[PDB]
Amino acid sequence: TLNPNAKEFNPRSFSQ
Amino acid sequence: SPLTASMLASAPPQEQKQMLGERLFPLIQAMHPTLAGKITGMLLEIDNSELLHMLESPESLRSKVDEAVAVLQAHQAKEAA
């Protein structure tokens, strides 16, 4: 199940 | 150039997560621009085959994102209090 303490994801760009 | 299961097979497990996140992120950000990085991070805990399914099934992705936002927001309520 989903853990709200998970590492944030960093995309290559936000214009994605 | 869509992401395919064979593309993912060419990569180390950690890179596969990043590759999956790259495709998921714009979709998640469209749904929830503020929470997008955190929501994506949460979903990336899921098995890669299931993440591929989510990329193929907008209904499946939307249900999972709804779940993640509700969990994140419930957690935030506990921390805010």
Instruction: Domain ranges for chain B, please list them.
Output: 4-76
Q: At what angle do helices B48-56 and B13-31 cross, to 10 degrees?
A: 30
Q: Which residues in chain B touch residue A11, judged by CB atoms under 8 angstroms apart?
A: 21-22, 25-26, 37, 40
Would you identify the CATH topology of the domain B4-76? c-terminal domain of poly(a) binding protein (1.10.1900)
Distance from CA of B56 to the nearest CA of A (A): 18
- Retrieve residue B12's tokens: 């180390």
Experimental method: X-ray
Resolution for the entry shown, Å? 1.7
Give CA B56 to chain center in angstroms: 12
DSSP string, A1-16: ---TTPPPP--S-S--
